[PDB]
Write a protein that binds this ligand. Structure first.
Ligand SMILES: CCCCCCCCCCCCC/C=C\[C@@H](O)[C@H](CO)NC(=O)CCCCCCC
Ligand SMILES: CCCCCCCCCCCCC/C=C\[C@@H](O)[C@H](CO)NC(=O)CCCCCCC
Ligand SMILES: *[C@@H]1O[C@H](CO)[C@@H](O[C@@H]2O[C@H](CO)[C@@H](O)[C@H](O)[C@H]2NC(C)=O)[C@H](O)[C@H]1NC(C)=O
Ligand SMILES: *[C@@H]1O[C@H](CO)[C@@H](O[C@@H]2O[C@H](CO)[C@@H](O)[C@H](O)[C@H]2NC(C)=O)[C@H](O)[C@H]1NC(C)=O
Ligand SMILES: *[C@@H]1O[C@H](CO)[C@@H](O[C@@H]2O[C@H](CO)[C@@H](O)[C@H](O)[C@H]2NC(C)=O)[C@H](O)[C@H]1NC(C)=O
Ligand SMILES: *[C@@H]1O[C@H](CO)[C@@H](O[C@@H]2O[C@H](CO)[C@@H](O)[C@H](O)[C@H]2NC(C)=O)[C@H](O)[C@H]1NC(C)=O
Ligand SMILES: CC(C)CCC[C@@H](C)[C@H]1CC[C@H]2[C@@H]3CC=C4C[C@@H](O)CC[C@]4(C)[C@H]3CC[C@]12C
Ligand SMILES: CC(C)CCC[C@@H](C)[C@H]1CC[C@H]2[C@@H]3CC=C4C[C@@H](O)CC[C@]4(C)[C@H]3CC[C@]12C
Ligand SMILES: CC(C)CCC[C@@H](C)[C@H]1CC[C@H]2[C@@H]3CC=C4C[C@@H](O)CC[C@]4(C)[C@H]3CC[C@]12C
Ligand SMILES: CC(C)CCC[C@@H](C)[C@H]1CC[C@H]2[C@@H]3CC=C4C[C@@H](O)CC[C@]4(C)[C@H]3CC[C@]12C
Ligand SMILES: CC(C)CCC[C@@H](C)[C@H]1CC[C@H]2[C@@H]3CC=C4C[C@@H](O)CC[C@]4(C)[C@H]3CC[C@]12C
Ligand SMILES: CC(C)CCC[C@@H](C)[C@H]1CC[C@H]2[C@@H]3CC=C4C[C@@H](O)CC[C@]4(C)[C@H]3CC[C@]12C
Ligand SMILES: CC(C)CCC[C@@H](C)[C@H]1CC[C@H]2[C@@H]3CC=C4C[C@@H](O)CC[C@]4(C)[C@H]3CC[C@]12C
Ligand SMILES: CC(C)CCC[C@@H](C)[C@H]1CC[C@H]2[C@@H]3CC=C4C[C@@H](O)CC[C@]4(C)[C@H]3CC[C@]12C
Ligand SMILES: CC(C)CCC[C@@H](C)[C@H]1CC[C@H]2[C@@H]3CC=C4C[C@@H](O)CC[C@]4(C)[C@H]3CC[C@]12C
Ligand SMILES: CC(C)CCC[C@@H](C)[C@H]1CC[C@H]2[C@@H]3CC=C4C[C@@H](O)CC[C@]4(C)[C@H]3CC[C@]12C
Ligand SMILES: CC(C)CCC[C@@H](C)[C@H]1CC[C@H]2[C@@H]3CC=C4C[C@@H](O)CC[C@]4(C)[C@H]3CC[C@]12C
Ligand SMILES: CC(C)CCC[C@@H](C)[C@H]1CC[C@H]2[C@@H]3CC=C4C[C@@H](O)CC[C@]4(C)[C@H]3CC[C@]12C
Ligand SMILES: CC(C)CCC[C@@H](C)[C@H]1CC[C@H]2[C@@H]3CC=C4C[C@@H](O)CC[C@]4(C)[C@H]3CC[C@]12C
Ligand SMILES: CCCCCCCC/C=C\CCCCCCCC(=O)O
Ligand SMILES: CCCCCCCC/C=C\CCCCCCCC(=O)O
Ligand SMILES: *[C@@H]1O[C@H](CO)[C@@H](O)[C@H](O)[C@H]1NC(C)=O
Ligand SMILES: *[C@@H]1O[C@H](CO)[C@@H](O)[C@H](O)[C@H]1NC(C)=O
Ligand SMILES: *[C@@H]1O[C@H](CO)[C@@H](O)[C@H](O)[C@H]1NC(C)=O
Ligand SMILES: *[C@@H]1O[C@H](CO)[C@@H](O)[C@H](O)[C@H]1NC(C)=O
Ligand SMILES: [Ca+2]
Ligand SMILES: [Ca+2]
Ligand SMILES: [Zn+2]
Ligand SMILES: [Zn+2]
Lengths: 647, 647
């Protein structure tokens, strides 16, 4: 079959609209011709319109270049998720460019476009081929564009000579439709279709925000393609059946803006590390200075098993989580799927094989303060033993160990946060609290009852509350039932505890009940995403509130408080308020899909390195340390009464 | 541009080879024509050869049907992983069929093939289009075929009326190349390329074996496509770069055989469940009968804290693993990626949202036997307390709790086994052993030393042995160093323990050292994949070995053993041998890639439901139960000596 393409190949012109009709006995061929100069990249874009009546007889389009062939049909057809189909009547595509070097010299390029159909009567089509003026992207310069499920887009970026790492930030003013942003290398072909985009490069699903960090050394040639693909449905991104506007003919157009910004320098790393270390070594320095001053001025003028048990439990609880997080990080590094970890992508600063180094270095406070508390408790125990030759020193040892373990477990969790890791850190605290409660109750012994066995019943209630939360997740009225039950249990347990230990008593009981009701109302306002964390927070706040009555009662002229006690109380209150402010700034969440979580990301404020969550870590560590110090040294004035004062 | 395809469209014939030459001013068009009858499926396959000299100027091939257009180029080009390129000079493709219904009636089908090129002089090509005689697959009938990286294959299967679930088994006689097997629905297009195969259906990577289970209710129309795609490199499947053969003329041909077999019926489920329950309720029945007989015949003629602590630790260790495994199972169900869990796919029988129901139901023995042991220990404790108004009853309570928790954790791990889960079950036993050892040493008190503090040093050594194993994985000489160090530590610890508690003493010490050296030699033969499990096994065998000397020494006429002791010991030896046989049959492994693990799968033997691993679970549970019973009731003759006999 001898056929000459040039016989009917109408030499066509760019930026010109060609209308036509084709059927079984007709085929249309257009020949486009251009030249590529050195040190310049030219991209060609093809556009085809066809009406909708061509359903059983679409129009087939073929594009031929020297080393590639591309093809498709109009109208494009998409399959839904529940047996639904969509059809699009406008298709566009960018042909993979081929740069020309100075050594190569200017290159002549030829392109062929063939339009055909098997319609019995005739199919109408419109065609338009153009060049792309804005194809290469610049640093720090925002660029706007529009994409469609049948008109994917992609652009080229070249690494500047000096820059070593960059961040791509993509922003839209509305979700629905939700799209995919991908980064790939220069070699053709470019995968820009729904079924092959997630195959080669690094990709993120997005609705309003996206941010990708890239390093130069991973890209031969120091350049890359950025591809944007829209999806036919919003199911994957937390959406229901695709939203259709009144105007829309089917089309889901998405307006996007993209920026590329250079990343920070290592000097920031050094400054942040030094600041983090010193801000907490200041505590050790101040304690040493105070001790030295006291020695210069004032001086001149049984639990071992209960410690080693905790050590063993901590170590053999910590190891497996470390291994699991290591596996998660390795998988995320290798596969390139950035929808596994719920980072705050706008302030995730990598180091080595670590994706978010700041989120882990922000946990030094827990470890250091726990170690300092353990040192203080050990010093007090040694002094007491020496003086004898102060009863629950094992409790304070457990407190310090729990603080250190919480720091370590949070550091492990932040390696790759998702909907599988919070439970470990949540549950270790429950285990420690249960062990401490059992030890305290056994040591105190029943004697009279003792009390009314309220603590064990409360701990059980917590047990099956957590079990139910694991079983039913936001299930109809079970959510409300469990919420109300837990709040009522907390209220009545607090009432019993206060009563078992006089108008002041009634006043305090009423205040506690009112505070519990306020907690219940706050929980009613915002639904609690996680039951265990909610219960832990309620328990902690109730503990501080009970300590509030204890201190107030002790301050009824019956006894006195030394400067260290009330200094610690004021510090604890101020730090608790400060940390509670940051506790409510959520930059991510595993409750929803990765795109919904990414919608909440934020840039970080302190020294260009730390976001809200790091500040929360610091403040929580400090507040817990000062609360523990208040608990330990509350009773010192009573030491005035000698002959075996209160233990 | 008016072009008439029929003017040069040479009406071509099937099963005929057409040779041709094309260049810039020439294009070849062939028209194929056929008819499709109702209740019959016809598939067309296209073949193109082109010599390798066409590197800069390949031959472009386009295939046009009524509602689809397909295109490609020859020679096909593949990009390697380390900047390597491959080219294939023979390409074949199957065109998506369109079934004809009786209501629709026979339909005439037309097809167009266009061959073009831009070579300045000319490019040679050979073309051949055929029908597929063997396209539909039959039940229980094996089918052989061959595939290539540039010649993917796929076939159609229709669900028989009676069958409700099927299994696809694919077998090859040699790995390298490694391929992907996918199952998709009827609706076209069919994704059979390297970059879009893993997008729609359910897929598995394979080298020698593959097995996929499917249920009818998930497929509208009760039919599906099975697709086989070969890969250009073996990196993903544990191999190196493309291994070139004498024939490789680049081509990596893979011969495959495929079978489709119906799945088992629910009667097997019922039988297996009933057998599993009754085989272990027999123990309860026998114990009850023996107790009743003894009562009829013979009769006629402090730890609470140590128990509740263990309960709390167990519960708050177990919960997070349950949540994690639930998440894993949900992800595997949704995504369809069957390379996440290392099941034994040849005997994985689903139920509900459970992929391998048998592997979990095979863990009833641990739970039931642990509960029975706890009941026995509680009965003995109650009897002793009543008689007083037997010193380490807390140890036996911990033993029973550990057995039950091991059963539960194994059940949790088998939901989705991979390289992230063994650590939890391995570490819980370490924690329990450490707690028990510490409590025993504290209760025994130092008195004289006590002993030489060897146990604590050994436990510490285990600590950093596990830490090093986590740090260095098969790292040069570190593997051998750690292996030898652990073996020497075990040997010298056993020597010290035996010496601290007379030629029999030296005889036993020499025997123990020889056994430890035998263990070291066995470890030398086969490299240990996991350090923690290896150490746990060594410790367990050393414990049984020590119990062996203890019983033998007691049997030197110094004391006597009642029938229950020696019956239990014989049962323990028999069951240990039986279970140790099955322990060495590994049907899967997470050390290598999923394909390598799948190479080891096996069908299951007992009642068509249980493989080797289930038998191992049963036997290990029984052996551990009988060993614990031997330990508890070893010292009963010493009861003859009254006035506070040995506790
Ligand atoms: C009973 C004897 C002593 C037991 C000591 C161990 C148990 C008490 C808690 C110890 C400290 C663990 C950290 C607590 C809370 C936070 O870190 C986390 C937030 O990630 N959970 C949260 O829920 C956030 C904190 C909520 C704060 C509420 C308002 C103060
Ligand atoms: C010290 C006082 C009593 C402490 C009681 C708790 C600690 C001892 C072990 C308790 C039973 C746990 C089960 C042990 C082993 C096996 O289940 C697993 C196999 O998956 N590990 C394996 O390594 C396989 C078993 C290896 C067997 C070696 C040959 C007998
Ligand atoms: C639709 O197909 C019909 C026949 O299959 C075409 O009819 C002839 O097409 C040739 C090719 O252009 C013309 O030279 C003849 O003049 C046509 N016949 C008549 C009676 O007009 C028809 O041209 C096709 N449609 C279009 C738009 O070309
Ligand atoms: C294809 O259809 C689209 C939409 O119907 C056309 O887009 C219009 O283009 C004109 C300029 O010629 C604009 O003034 C309109 O606002 C556009 N409509 C939109 C964006 O909805 C397009 O011109 C048609 N032709 C081709 C070759 O694509
Ligand atoms: C390769 O291209 C050349 C020119 O571009 C072709 O030369 C002419 O091709 C036409 C097409 O059939 C013939 O009618 C002429 O007779 C050819 N010229 C001569 C001098 O023979 C050439 O045919 C192309 N290659 C092939 C195999 O057709
Ligand atoms: C393309 O090349 C292949 C291999 O070079 C050809 O396959 C041969 O086919 C003949 C039958 O015509 C067999 O006798 C040979 O054994 C095959 N060689 C193999 C399998 O290596 C094929 O015929 C060529 N032609 C086409 C159209 O594919
Ligand atoms: C190759 C480039 C990125 C190197 C730039 C220097 C960076 C990576 C170095 C400079 C100082 C270093 C820190 C110095 C001290 C500490 C405290 C220690 O407890 C953990 C490591 C940590 C936090 C180091 C992390 C890495 C660090 C921040
Ligand atoms: C035996 C008992 C009384 C010991 C009590 C612990 C004492 C030494 C602790 C409790 C609270 C501590 C202080 C808490 C906070 C700060 C602020 C810091 O910028 C300097 C150190 C300084 C001022 C600490 C010094 C040591 C301190 C006073
Ligand atoms: C009590 C004190 C000493 C505990 C200190 C624990 C610190 C050193 C541990 C806890 C969790 C650890 C991280 C866990 C996982 C990974 C991922 C791996 O790919 C690189 C190392 C990295 C990032 C670890 C670095 C060290 C780490 C932060
Ligand atoms: C003692 C402790 C460890 C026991 C814990 C048992 C819990 C975790 C078990 C018991 C029954 C289980 C449920 C049984 C059935 C279903 C329905 C299924 O569609 C989803 C899983 C779900 C909801 C299971 C989740 C886990 C579950 C709630
Ligand atoms: C939301 C889930 C996932 C985790 C967090 C739950 C817990 C920790 C939250 C939810 C309800 C919260 C409390 C609601 C109301 C009050 C009263 C206010 O005057 C101080 C803060 C305080 C005391 C909050 C502290 C934090 C809290 C206890
Ligand atoms: C230990 C506690 C009770 C001491 C007092 C803490 C007080 C001051 C805390 C608890 C709840 C906190 C508020 C919680 C939420 C908001 C809304 C936010 O848009 C601004 C901060 C603001 C307004 C916080 C300010 C500080 C706050 C009022
Ligand atoms: C809808 C089809 C698949 C139903 C077929 C019946 C199957 C699913 C039924 C029949 C008997 C059932 C078993 C009966 C008793 C037990 C013991 C219990 O401790 C766990 C559940 C378990 C193991 C059941 C699992 C489900 C089971 C095996
Ligand atoms: C108070 C002390 C001495 C009680 C010791 C426990 C006794 C009752 C236990 C120890 C070993 C047990 C036996 C172990 C195995 C079997 C085989 C089974 O097919 C029937 C029950 C039978 C025969 C058990 C009966 C109960 C048994 C004899
Ligand atoms: C001490 C005894 C009572 C403990 C019994 C534990 C049993 C009931 C628990 C332990 C682990 C659990 C499984 C863990 C995870 C899943 C996956 C989920 O999608 C369906 C339920 C299923 C398959 C659970 C079924 C119930 C289960 C097997
Ligand atoms: C809410 C949704 C978006 C959360 C998504 C979490 C899913 C995708 C995560 C959670 C656990 C992850 C798996 C954890 C471990 C393995 C085993 C490894 O050999 C390959 C990766 C693989 C298989 C991971 C793939 C991604 C994974 C399945
Ligand atoms: C007290 C216990 C919990 C401390 C455990 C610390 C362990 C887990 C930490 C300390 C130092 C860490 C290593 C530091 C550096 C590297 C090199 C990197 O390429 C892979 C991770 C690896 C190999 C880390 C693995 C985890 C590690 C070994
Ligand atoms: C291999 C890793 C992953 C887990 C298994 C390691 C442990 C449990 C293995 C490795 C070495 C093994 C031992 C090697 C040699 C002997 C001596 C033989 O007469 C009885 C079995 C016995 C006593 C084996 C028992 C199981 C064992 C202790
Ligand atoms: C508690 C122990 C020491 C009691 C004695 C157990 C003996 C009989 C066990 C330990 C190691 C076992 C062997 C381990 C490996 C093999 C190779 C396999 O192809 C056939 C079974 C065979 C040959 C096993 C037979 C049983 C065996 C010899
Ligand atoms: C409780 C957490 C306390 C965190 C203390 C400081 C954390 C240090 C973390 C690791 C630093 C080194 C490992 C990071 C990547 C190593 C690769 C490399 O440095 O080349
Ligand atoms: C230690 C493990 C002991 C195992 C005991 C028996 C295991 C029973 C497991 C669950 C049975 C029901 C849950 C399985 C899928 C539920 C969905 C359904 O049945 O419809
Ligand atoms: C493309 O344009 C150049 C510019 O004149 C011309 O030399 C060349 O012949 C054209 N290509 C074809 C195929 O005509
Ligand atoms: C190629 O040569 C031209 C000729 O001056 C030069 O301007 C250009 O910089 C060269 N290309 C590169 C990458 O240096
Ligand atoms: C295809 O073959 C049938 C069989 O006779 C014929 O009627 C029909 O016209 C053919 N199609 C074309 C396009 O020639
Ligand atoms: C279609 O009709 C023919 C005519 O007898 C019949 O044989 C065939 O079974 C029908 N198809 C189906 C799916 O029943
Ligand atoms: Ca590419
Ligand atoms: Ca399909
Ligand atoms: Zn955090
Ligand atoms: Zn197992």
């Amino acid at each position: 079959p001898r056929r000459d393409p040039f016989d009917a190949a109408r030499g066509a012109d760019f930026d010109h609209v060609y209308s036509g009709v084709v059927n079984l006995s007709t085929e249309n061929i257009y020949s486009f011709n251009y030249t590529s100069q050195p040190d310049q990249v030219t991209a060609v874009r093809v556009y085809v319109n066809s009406s909708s009546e061509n359903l059983n007889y679409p129009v087939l389009v073929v594009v031929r270049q020297q080393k590639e062939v591309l093809s498709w049909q109009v109208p494009l057809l998409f399959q839904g998720l529940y047996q639904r189909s969509y059809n699009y009547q406008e298709v566009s595509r960018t042909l993979c460019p081929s740069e020309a070097t100075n050594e190569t010299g200017p290159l002549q390029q030829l392109i062929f476009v063939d339009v055909a159909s098997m319609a019995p009567l005739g199919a109408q089509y419109k065609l338009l081929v153009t060049k792309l003026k804005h194809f290469q992207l610049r640093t720090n310069v925002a660029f706007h564009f529009t994409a469609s499920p049948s008109q994917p887009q992609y652009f080229l970026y070249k690494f500047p000579k000096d820059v070593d790492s960059v961040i791509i930030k993509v922003v839209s003013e509305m979700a629905y439709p939700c799209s995919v942003v991908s980064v790939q290398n220069i070699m053709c072909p470019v995968y820009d279709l729904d079924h092959n985009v997630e195959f080669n490069g690094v990709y993120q699903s997005m609705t309003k925000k996206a941010a990708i960090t890239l390093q130069k050394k991973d890209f031969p040639g120091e350049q890359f393609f950025v591809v944007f693909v829209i999806k036919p449905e919003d199911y994957a991104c937390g959406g229901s059946f695709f939203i259709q506007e009144k105007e829309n003919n089917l089309q889901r157009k998405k307006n996007l803006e993209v920026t590329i910004v250079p990343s920070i320098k290592e000097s920031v790393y050094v400054k942040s590390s030094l600041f983090s270390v010193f801000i907490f070594l200041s505590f050790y320095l101040g304690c040493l200075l105070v001790g030295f001053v006291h020695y210069l001025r004032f001086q001149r003028k049984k639990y071992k098993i209960y410690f080693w048990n905790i050590i063993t439990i901590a170590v053999f609880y910590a190891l497996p989580v470390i291994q699991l997080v290591i596996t998660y990080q390795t998988v995320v590094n290798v596969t390139g799927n950035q929808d596994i970890c719920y980072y705050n992508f706008l302030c995730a600063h990598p180091l080595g094989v670590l994706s978010a180094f700041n989120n882990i270095l922000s946990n030094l406070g827990h470890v250091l303060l726990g170690f300092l508390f353990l040192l203080i408790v050990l010093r007090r125990d040694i002094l007491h033993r020496r003086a004898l030759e102060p009863k629950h020193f094992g409790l304070f040892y457990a407190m310090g160990i729990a603080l250190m373990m919480e720091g370590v477990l949070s550091a492990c969790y932040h390696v790759c946060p998702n909907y599988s890791n919070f439970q470990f850190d949540t549950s270790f605290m429950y285990m420690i609290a249960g062990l401490c409660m059992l030890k305290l109750y056994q040591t105190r012994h029943p004697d009279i009852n003792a009390s009314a066995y309220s603590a064990y019943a409360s701990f059980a209630v917590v047990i099956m509350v957590t079990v139910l939360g694991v079983v039913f997740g936001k299930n109809d009225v079970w959510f409300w039932v469990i919420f109300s039950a837990i709040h009522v249990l907390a209220s009545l347990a607090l009432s019993t505890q206060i009563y078992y230990m006089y108008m002041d008593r009634m006043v305090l009981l009423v205040v506690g009940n009112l505070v519990n009701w306020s907690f219940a109302l706050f929980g009613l306002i915002y639904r609690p995403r996680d039951f265990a964390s909610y219960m832990l927070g309620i328990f902690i706040c109730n503990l501080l509130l009970y300590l509030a009555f204890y201190i107030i009662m002790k301050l009824r002229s019956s006894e006195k408080v030394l400067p260290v006690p009330l200094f610690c109380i004021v510090a604890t209150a101020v730090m608790w308020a400060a940390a509670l402010y940051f506790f409510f700034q959520n930059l991510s969440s595993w409750e929803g899909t990765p795109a919904e979580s990414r919608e909440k990301n934020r840039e970080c404020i302190l020294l260009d390195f730390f976001d809200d969550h790091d500040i929360w870590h610091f403040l929580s560590a400090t507040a817990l340390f000062f609360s523990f110090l208040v608990l330990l040294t509350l009773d010192d004035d009573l030491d005035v009464v000698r002959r075996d004062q209160i233990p």
